[PDB]
Ligand binder design. Structure first.
Ligand code: HEC
Length: 81
């Protein structure tokens, strides 16, 4: 949930419903709706960073996020659709 997202600074660069710096969380949700192991995939983007899927500004690695927290954030975002 978004208390986790706040602690881990996700919810400045992102918003649920609309693009800020990073894409809207509900857009991530809809894009990967049918990706399998989408949650592992998104925890991995969250921990190690992302480049070029949504724009030319990359997401740096979120090095202080735990695996469990990255997985919980990814699961939460997936439920957003
Ligand atoms: C807090 C720890 C988080 C979480 C859970 C996520 N982010 Fe970001 N993010 C940012 C940008 C510019 C992008 C697009 C990057 C690109 O074009 O490749 C993203 C992308 C994501 C994704 C999508 C990954 C994918 O493969 O589609 C996800 C799941 C995600 N974020 C979650 C920008 C930022 C930030 C600005 C500095 C910060 C801080 C975060 N994101 C933090 C988080």
């Amino acid at each position: 949930d978004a208390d986790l997202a706040k602690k881990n600074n996700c919810i400045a660069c992102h918003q649920v419903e609309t693009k800020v710096v990073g894409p809207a969380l509900k857009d991530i949700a809809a894009k990967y709706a049918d990706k399998d192991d989408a949650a592992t995939y998104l925890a991995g983007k969250i921990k190690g960073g992302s480049s070029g899927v949504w724009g030319q500004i990359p997401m740096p690695p979120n090095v202080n996020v735990s695996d469990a927290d990255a997985k919980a954030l990814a699961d939460w975002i997936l439920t957003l659709k």
